[PDB]
């Protein structure tokens, strides 16, 4: 029937490199994603199981603005300025 | 823990070639030479009497 190939004559990229994330999981045909939701407002990130959750949360990356959080209101809505006092 | 050993659920082979019950971890030569969790087998100890 096959002759021999099952993964033989393979030369057509199915899931292309996802521009949204980069996990390579999107096709032009069905126009749907399998990483974090592509053309739509959806986001493939659920909470089932004891795993596969933190990779869509926070704490494991950059958080360039979340560092500005734990910073400002440590005193009391500081949005003004300051100067010298004791050298 | 409610997630100690609660993170593995696969299926291995049966009759034929010489192979015991080890959840065939995907990828040939990935270090996980037939591992998982479950009870007192796969590389992941078990804890009798769940501490209430």
């Amino acid at each position: 029937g096959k002759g021999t190939p099952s993964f033989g004559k393979r030369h057509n990229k199915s899931h292309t490199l996802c521009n949204r994330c980069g996990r390579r999981s999107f096709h032009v045909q069905k126009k749907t994603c399998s990483s974090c939701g592509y053309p739509a407002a959806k986001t493939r990130s659920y909470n089932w199981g004891a795993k596969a959750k933190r990779r869509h949360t926070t704490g494991t990356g950059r958080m360039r603005y979340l560092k500005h959080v734990s910073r400002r209101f440590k005193n009391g809505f500081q949005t003004g300025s300051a100067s010298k006092a004791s050298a | 823990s409610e997630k100690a050993g609660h993170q593995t659920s696969a299926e291995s082979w049966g009759t034929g070639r010489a192979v015991a019950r080890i959840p065939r971890v995907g990828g040939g030569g990935t270090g996980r030479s037939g591992q998982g969790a479950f009870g007192n087998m796969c590389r992941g100890g078990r804890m009798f009497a769940p501490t209430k």
Partner: protein, 50 residues
């Protein structure tokens, strides 16, 4: 071949710098216990396939 695109090729253009690990100075640094990195690859015989 070569012909593809940029956006796809851009994401695949970074392993060129992975061809240059430790010259003659990284071997002895500040409290370094990890010498060579285990992320090297040469696809002459290696089959990464992303």
């Amino acid at each position: 071949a070569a012909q593809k695109s940029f956006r796809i090729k851009q994401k695949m253009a970074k392993a060129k710098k992975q061809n240059r690990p430790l010259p003659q100075w990284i071997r002895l640094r500040t409290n370094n216990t990890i010498r060579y990195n285990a992320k090297r690859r040469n696809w002459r015989r290696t089959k990464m396939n992303i």
